[PDB]
Amino acid sequence: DYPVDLYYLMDLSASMDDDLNTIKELGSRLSKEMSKLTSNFRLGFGSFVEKPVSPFVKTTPEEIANPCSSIPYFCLPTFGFKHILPLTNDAERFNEIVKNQKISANIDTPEGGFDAIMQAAVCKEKIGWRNDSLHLLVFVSDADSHFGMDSKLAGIVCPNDGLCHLDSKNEYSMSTVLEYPTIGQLIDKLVQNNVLLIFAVTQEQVHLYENYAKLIPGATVGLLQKDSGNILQLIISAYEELRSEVEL
Amino acid sequence: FNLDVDSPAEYSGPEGSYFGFAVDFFVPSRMFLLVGAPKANTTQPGIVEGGQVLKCDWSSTRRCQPIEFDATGNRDYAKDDPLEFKSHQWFGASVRSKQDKILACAPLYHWRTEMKQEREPVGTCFLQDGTKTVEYAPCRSQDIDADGQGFCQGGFSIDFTKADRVLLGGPGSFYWQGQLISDQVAEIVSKYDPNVYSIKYNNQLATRTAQAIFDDSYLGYSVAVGDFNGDGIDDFVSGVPRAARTLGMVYIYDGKNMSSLYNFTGEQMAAYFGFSVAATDINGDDYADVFIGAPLFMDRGSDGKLQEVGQVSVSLQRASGDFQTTKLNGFEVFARFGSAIAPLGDLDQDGFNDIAIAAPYGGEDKKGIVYIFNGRSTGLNAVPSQILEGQWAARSGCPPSFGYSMKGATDIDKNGYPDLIVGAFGVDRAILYRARPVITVNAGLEVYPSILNQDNKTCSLPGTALKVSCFNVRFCLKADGKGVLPRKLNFQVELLLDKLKQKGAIRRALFLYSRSPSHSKNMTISRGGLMQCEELIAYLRDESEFRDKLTPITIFMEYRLDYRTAADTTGLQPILNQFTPANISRQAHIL
Ligand SMILES: *[C@@H]1O[C@H](CO)[C@@H](O[C@@H]2O[C@H](CO)[C@@H](O[C@@H]3O[C@H](CO[C@H]4O[C@H](CO[C@H]5O[C@H](CO)[C@@H](O)[C@H](O)[C@@H]5O)[C@@H](O)[C@H](O[C@H]5O[C@H](CO)[C@@H](O)[C@H](O)[C@@H]5O)[C@@H]4O)[C@@H](O)[C@H](O[C@H]4O[C@H](CO)[C@@H](O)[C@H](O)[C@@H]4O[C@H]4O[C@H](CO)[C@@H](O)[C@H](O)[C@@H]4O)[C@@H]3O)[C@H](O)[C@H]2NC(C)=O)[C@H](O)[C@H]1NC(C)=O
Ligand SMILES: *[C@@H]1O[C@H](CO)[C@@H](O[C@@H]2O[C@H](CO)[C@@H](O[C@@H]3O[C@H](CO[C@H]4O[C@H](CO)[C@@H](O)[C@H](O[C@H]5O[C@H](CO)[C@@H](O)[C@H](O)[C@@H]5O)[C@@H]4O)[C@@H](O)[C@H](O[C@H]4O[C@H](CO)[C@@H](O)[C@H](O)[C@@H]4O)[C@@H]3O)[C@H](O)[C@H]2NC(C)=O)[C@H](O)[C@H]1NC(C)=O
Ligand SMILES: *[C@@H]1O[C@H](CO)[C@@H](O[C@@H]2O[C@H](CO)[C@@H](O[C@@H]3O[C@H](CO)[C@@H](O)[C@H](O)[C@@H]3O)[C@H](O)[C@H]2NC(C)=O)[C@H](O)[C@H]1NC(C)=O
Ligand SMILES: *[C@@H]1O[C@H](CO)[C@@H](O[C@@H]2O[C@H](CO)[C@@H](O[C@@H]3O[C@H](CO)[C@@H](O)[C@H](O)[C@@H]3O)[C@H](O)[C@H]2NC(C)=O)[C@H](O)[C@H]1NC(C)=O
Ligand SMILES: *[C@@H]1O[C@H](CO)[C@@H](O[C@@H]2O[C@H](CO)[C@@H](O)[C@H](O)[C@H]2NC(C)=O)[C@H](O)[C@H]1NC(C)=O
Ligand SMILES: *[C@@H]1O[C@H](CO)[C@@H](O)[C@H](O)[C@H]1NC(C)=O
Ligand SMILES: *[C@@H]1O[C@H](CO)[C@@H](O)[C@H](O)[C@H]1NC(C)=O
Ligand SMILES: [Ca+2]
Ligand SMILES: [Ca+2]
Ligand SMILES: [Ca+2]
Ligand SMILES: [Ca+2]
Ligand SMILES: [Ca+2]
Ligand SMILES: [Ca+2]
């Protein structure tokens, strides 16, 4: 028996809209299962899409206001990383927050997940990581990720500093200022903050993120279904996987 | 090793303008430094932070002047319908110069397209050939939107060939497959029309759109030129850093028909293999060699754990078409060794080209480091012969980024050696390091007689009666150089008798007039002339004073240049070559 922290970090591109519909009651269902395995479980929520700058995002006034004018559908303007829910014991609070989320742009390119992973690992007080507990960071996405100097296309040439940049609205305020973290920078911060990174990604992304995880200590990869239908089982499996570190 | 780091020329621009993001030379006459300031405010009407390229002169104290490529604002497609968007276009993010030609580009330049009201970053370049200044935007076409060239960002990287072709990289073409575009400079200027926004060039070489699996590759992220099929035509080298599922690749295309010639592939995920590339013959065989930067490469530490140090691969073009590849790892964690790779030419004029590799975030206070590597017959010397340190701390958002851009292979002061510009955009600075001239010394050392009979007491010690067994120590000194250098070279020469005696053994040989094993002598010599020599008498201790009669008595001569008084009219002090030991030894034997 050991306390567990879970931070749900979800891709909110339009392709994750059906995933959102299936997670509507994941919070209460997950804390019911974790109740079997531990007595102290706390879950939180955050979301991400991409750096809201050219060329990663169309930049006419209308396309900024609605990056889904092509569906045609109403969706939120692209955003970098929103930290919605600090990890808490209230599973119902997780439910209503999920039911109130809305998908942003309909991206089919790599995304800015690494920015959010960095913020989730580093912002200890904001995300709410407990000192003596397992830190599980679940990364839910159906797309590849941008890293490092990919932001050079946007004129973003200041490297990531690995500091916490949440602007009171719990939004990443350096999304347009700093570069995407590098894998070496993520490794450095995930290890220092004792964060176990779970890549719950769809089939086209599994092998790619497998290779990323093989460089990142404590990282694992789970094959996520297109509507996130198996995310509950993936989290329990990953938790029980990390709970037995053979490590030869 | 011969770069003068004591008094380099420091050029600076407006704060926040990223002065130094791209640097180059200009040799049309006098010579100049070309510095890019892509975030610089200009006088263009309504254009916020259009960016500029500045021409800095070497002769005068700094005094940099912006080069007016375009003074106009945003052209209108129609009334209240702007055709283009030049604000924050990053003009000067890449500057490339060849003789009287200057090519600068704005990779974040957006335009409307002529079909609908969009805002697509096609990128644009301005070319300045002598008097006429033309615009060059090969991606500003009717093939619009991300599927086409709408997000191509042409001019993200540029280069010139040796036959007057431009090589332009557009990493965003075809859903970020990227693209290489090559146009003849003559067709670019002749077909330029300020009322035509999509100009078709007949001799254009361009890569084509491929299958969707090659999306998200960023071909054209960096570029370089060099011949790789032995036909005299410079071929196209380009980093493709997101190719092979973020393993990264480097494509080589023939510079005549854009056919694929060779491929390199990174060996570690997300190391950004291909961020920077360079092509120069490093081992003196006239076959250009490939340098591929991977600034995020993680190697193994002493503890076995990965550490991000960055890596440069050195690929020697074999005559058989193959490549002999080795790898050069960075020295500091997170320094991003390999972010910039600048061929320097032959920095020391020893017959082999040299190269600089920057770690823009290394050194104290993350002020940046540049490493100097010399070539030789067997390839690149893995150990750097000089370390260039940044001096300017960061009080800005960005770190100083000393080394993030640099240019070599141009002798800006006509001293016979190529020099090096190093940009530091985080502190709005560019620094010119001038190569010091290299002294080749031919030293001589004669010991006669070379076999010493202790019973042969010729000389007598000054002030006493007992004679000693003596011999003459004659040392000669001769120097010359290939570049522009003064005549009077001041040498400080040291001689030590019986240097290679055993640990704690008795000094067996001493100088006659001094009764000391060491002798110092200052020698002013003029280069090119005959050898200047000096004779001196040394003697052995009495045979009863020591037992080691079998060890050869080695006469050791050490010489160093004074450096203090040999400065040139430009204050450029010479330096001795590193490949040569600045010492000589000669041994004598006892009977
Ligand atoms: C080959 O050439 C070189 C130069 O081209 C010769 O070097 C010179 O050698 C002479 C000795 O013959 C030295 O004189 C002695 O200096 C020491 C200490 O010197 C210090 O001060 C120097 C002053 O420099 C000023 O000017 C410069 C600008 O030019 C300014 O920047 C300075 O700030 C000063 O204002 C200074 O130059 C020295 O620095 C040197 O060393 C440092 C390392 O320490 C280097 O980095 C530097 O680059 C530079 O090379 C130094 O800081 C004094 O202490 C000596 O005084 C006594 O000792 C002598 C014996 O050593 C003795 O003969 C004197 O008479 C004297 O007093 C004695 O005699 C009394 C009788 O009257 C006795 O009663 C008494 O007890 C005592 O025994 C002496 O003045 C030069 O400084 C030196 N210069 C340089 C540039 O190196 C070299 O000798 C030549 N070799 C041969 C084989 O020919
Ligand atoms: C360095 O690395 C680069 C990058 O990897 C290499 O460049 C790549 O080379 C390969 C090998 O040639 C290229 O693949 C080929 O692409 C052609 C393109 O054909 C196009 O036009 C056809 C009409 O003539 C059309 O039919 C094609 O349609 C494709 O797409 C549809 C829709 O999905 C699909 O249904 C088709 O089946 C096609 O796939 C296409 O638009 C293609 O014709 C080639 O097919 C042959 O070869 C493959 C095996 O390679 C074989 O399986 C096939 O049966 C057929 O025999 C082939 O796929 C690729 O495009 C290049 N990528 C670039 C340039 O970015 C480069 O070669 C390397 N150099 C060196 C020296 O190693
Ligand atoms: C694009 O241009 C390059 C050259 O710029 C072409 O490469 C050339 O390919 C031909 C045939 O593949 C080579 O000819 C060969 O010559 C050797 C003798 O050296 C002979 O033994 C062979 O049987 C063959 O005839 C030619 O050498 C080679 N050129 C170079 C410089 O290597 C390439 O084929 C062109 N591509 C297209 C699509 O046109
Ligand atoms: C005993 O020791 C003395 C002194 O060390 C030796 O005398 C030296 O002999 C050498 C011969 O090798 C002389 O060098 C010669 O000089 C002439 C004139 O410059 C030159 O033409 C010759 O080619 C040769 O180099 C040297 O001058 C001489 N020294 C003195 C002071 O006269 C002597 O040879 C020793 N006895 C032996 C070895 O039996
Ligand atoms: C270029 O000039 C613009 C103004 O024309 C500067 O933009 C201002 O930047 C400050 C930030 O300190 C903002 O608070 C202002 O709102 C900006 N003004 C406008 C009109 O955008 C910009 O800082 C200048 N940059 C350089 C490098 O000179
Ligand atoms: C948590 O542990 C760290 C040491 O790893 C310590 O510095 C910090 O003060 C602790 N915080 C709490 C709230 O216990
Ligand atoms: C002479 O200098 C060289 C440096 O090239 C050095 O390796 C050698 O040890 C020196 N000679 C002696 C006797 O120390
Ligand atoms: Ca997505
Ligand atoms: Ca879905
Ligand atoms: Ca060629
Ligand atoms: Ca070579
Ligand atoms: Ca050299
Ligand atoms: Ca020079």
Tab-separated table of C-alpha atoms in Angstrom, chain A residues 54-61 63 106 108-110 114 144-160 178-185 187-188 204-205 207-208 211-212 214-216, chain B residues 18 21 39 90 107-108 110 117-121 145-146 151 153 156 171-172 175-176 216 218 221 241-242 245-246 268-272 275 295-296 298 306 308 334 336 339 361 366 397-399 401 404 425:
chain	number	residue	atom	x	y	z
A	54	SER	CA	2.750	30.513	-37.105
A	55	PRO	CA	3.470	28.184	-38.797
A	56	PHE	CA	2.028	25.653	-36.339
A	57	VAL	CA	-1.324	27.468	-36.486
A	58	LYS	CA	-3.160	29.430	-39.166
A	59	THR	CA	-3.034	33.104	-38.304
A	60	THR	CA	-5.861	34.996	-39.994
A	61	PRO	CA	-8.173	36.673	-37.442
A	63	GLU	CA	-8.796	31.078	-38.211
A	106	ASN	CA	-8.192	19.802	-35.763
A	108	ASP	CA	-2.964	16.406	-37.994
A	109	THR	CA	0.681	17.421	-37.430
A	110	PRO	CA	2.961	16.880	-34.431
A	114	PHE	CA	6.502	18.076	-24.592
A	144	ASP	CA	3.574	12.786	-32.629
A	145	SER	CA	5.291	15.546	-30.654
A	146	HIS	CA	7.477	18.523	-31.441
A	147	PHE	CA	10.749	18.805	-29.572
A	148	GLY	CA	13.699	21.131	-29.165
A	149	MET	CA	14.458	23.396	-32.115
A	150	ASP	CA	11.239	22.609	-33.974
A	151	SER	CA	10.119	26.016	-32.694
A	152	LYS	CA	12.884	27.629	-34.781
A	153	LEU	CA	10.301	27.652	-37.579
A	154	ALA	CA	8.247	30.030	-35.412
A	155	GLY	CA	11.204	32.275	-34.602
A	156	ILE	CA	11.387	30.793	-31.097
A	157	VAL	CA	15.095	30.366	-30.411
A	158	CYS	CA	15.412	30.656	-26.637
A	159	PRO	CA	15.920	27.124	-25.250
A	160	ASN	CA	13.577	25.701	-22.650
A	178	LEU	CA	10.618	29.329	-25.137
A	179	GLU	CA	11.512	26.357	-27.307
A	180	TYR	CA	10.041	22.911	-26.917
A	181	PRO	CA	12.061	20.936	-24.356
A	182	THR	CA	14.580	18.404	-25.597
A	183	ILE	CA	14.416	14.759	-24.565
A	184	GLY	CA	17.573	15.321	-22.516
A	185	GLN	CA	15.844	18.220	-20.758
A	187	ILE	CA	14.828	13.265	-18.699
A	188	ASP	CA	16.607	15.751	-16.437
A	204	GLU	CA	0.485	4.982	-35.324
A	205	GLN	CA	2.365	6.601	-32.415
A	207	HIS	CA	6.509	2.534	-31.899
A	208	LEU	CA	7.715	6.145	-32.079
A	211	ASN	CA	11.734	4.690	-28.734
A	212	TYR	CA	11.346	7.927	-26.774
A	214	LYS	CA	13.630	3.800	-24.024
A	215	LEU	CA	15.724	6.943	-23.507
A	216	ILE	CA	13.532	8.243	-20.654
B	18	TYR	CA	18.946	39.642	-32.453
B	21	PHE	CA	21.657	35.852	-35.646
B	39	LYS	CA	14.014	41.388	-35.058
B	90	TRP	CA	12.613	37.975	-39.585
B	107	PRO	CA	11.531	33.111	-43.378
B	108	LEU	CA	8.513	34.350	-41.380
B	110	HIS	CA	3.537	35.958	-44.695
B	117	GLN	CA	-7.600	36.240	-47.984
B	118	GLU	CA	-5.077	33.992	-46.244
B	119	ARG	CA	-1.880	34.637	-44.254
B	120	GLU	CA	0.617	32.032	-45.375
B	121	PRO	CA	4.396	31.998	-44.358
B	145	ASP	CA	-1.796	26.212	-48.411
B	146	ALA	CA	0.108	23.662	-46.325
B	151	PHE	CA	3.972	27.271	-45.330
B	153	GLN	CA	9.229	29.450	-45.349
B	156	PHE	CA	15.062	29.369	-43.961
B	171	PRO	CA	11.292	23.219	-44.592
B	172	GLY	CA	7.502	23.610	-44.639
B	175	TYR	CA	2.961	19.438	-45.223
B	176	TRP	CA	6.488	20.011	-43.893
B	216	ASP	CA	7.033	16.122	-41.072
B	218	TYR	CA	11.796	19.512	-42.486
B	221	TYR	CA	16.181	23.115	-42.389
B	241	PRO	CA	16.094	16.736	-38.961
B	242	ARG	CA	12.651	15.155	-38.430
B	245	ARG	CA	10.765	9.317	-37.379
B	246	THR	CA	12.897	12.014	-35.667
B	268	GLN	CA	19.506	8.465	-31.803
B	269	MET	CA	15.913	9.620	-31.424
B	270	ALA	CA	15.319	13.379	-31.220
B	271	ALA	CA	19.008	14.320	-31.362
B	272	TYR	CA	18.176	16.793	-34.176
B	275	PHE	CA	20.249	20.874	-37.486
B	295	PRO	CA	23.212	19.244	-31.029
B	296	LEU	CA	20.870	17.115	-28.884
B	298	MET	CA	23.094	12.105	-25.742
B	306	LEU	CA	22.927	9.370	-20.836
B	308	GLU	CA	22.999	15.533	-23.732
B	334	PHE	CA	23.268	20.929	-22.599
B	336	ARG	CA	24.429	21.891	-27.824
B	339	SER	CA	24.633	23.855	-33.382
B	361	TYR	CA	25.171	27.394	-24.479
B	366	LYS	CA	26.122	29.775	-20.424
B	397	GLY	CA	15.175	36.501	-22.550
B	398	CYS	CA	17.570	34.500	-24.724
B	399	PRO	CA	21.039	33.361	-23.624
B	401	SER	CA	24.153	32.306	-27.941
B	404	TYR	CA	25.012	30.225	-32.822
B	425	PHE	CA	22.365	37.382	-31.009
